[PDB]
Amino acid sequence: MIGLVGKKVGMTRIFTEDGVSIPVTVIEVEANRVTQVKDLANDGYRAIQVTTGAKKANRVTKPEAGHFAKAGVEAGRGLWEFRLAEGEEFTVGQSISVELFADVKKVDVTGTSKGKGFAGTVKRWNFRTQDATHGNSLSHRVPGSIGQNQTPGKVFKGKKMAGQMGNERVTVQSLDVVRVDAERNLLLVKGAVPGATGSDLIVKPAVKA
């Protein structure tokens, strides 16, 4: 089934009547407007493309402005589309609310993780550091050996080395949905989700049922 696009809004905890406190991530899921519906006849697959939020009138380009005007949908920030499960249908211009998550229990949240920049092997791949004393010289956090000898004669592809860490989309799956608030457009999910505050997130029902 289709997901929804929301914005991460900090974190909080919910106190239950029995005493236990549930850490919850707050996701602001306002109305999602369908801008385009894809069908097997034309696109070879069925999907719905949705938009959310708002954009400055002078900031949206003409190609994007015409695309929204065709669907009669107010311009929003970015576009995302979700594949259909063959059991439901949608129409252009339809608005989708967070209420569809009322009957679900597990969700999958996808977002861009925080960017750590160029990271070393110790931080990136949990490499073990070498001794800080006992004669060690300029080799306290160095990766160490990266190959065997002449017989391979090369470093194998996929070697773990320092490089860019974070700033890629990652998915946290099977997260418990704690509360849904349609009128206030909130979705409380137990746990933590990728990305920093204000980052766009995609929420869909858990697939590992």
Partner: protein, 122 residues
């Protein structure tokens, strides 16, 4: 957070006063023992008249930790020292007759009934 080579006090009156943890049981490559995990210890100094002598290896259960324990609502319990209770290596069965100091309720595993009963508090 009890790991190998850690000093522990003895809550019971078995005659031991200070013990060394030499192994954390319950899993391969386990790092440190929790609130109520079984550990293997060696006695470093005990009462001469006690039933347990120095330099003997026997199991033990942690009852108090300096690091503390976490409650489901976010509360924590912390102590000024680490304490344990002695065992029999074949059946858990704390050999002590009385245990001093508070004991947390995390040990209620349908089994440590003897420990909790002897506990002056909780």
């Amino acid at each position: 957070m009890i790991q190998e080579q850690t000093m522990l006090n003895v809550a019971d009156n078995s005659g031991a006063r200070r013990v060394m943890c030499i192994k954390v049981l319950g899993g391969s490559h386990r790092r440190y023992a929790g609130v109520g995990d079984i550990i293997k210890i060696t006695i470093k100094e005990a009462i001469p008249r006690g039933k347990v002598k120095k330099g003997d290896v026997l199991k033990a259960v942690v009852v108090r930790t300096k690091k503390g324990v976490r409650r489901p609502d976010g509360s924590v319990i912390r102590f000024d020292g680490n304490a344990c209770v002695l065992l029999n290596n074949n059946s858990e069965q704390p050999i002590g007759t009385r245990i001093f100091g508070p004991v947390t309720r995390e040990l209620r595993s349908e089994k440590f009934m003897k420990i909790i009963s002897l506990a002056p508090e909780v």
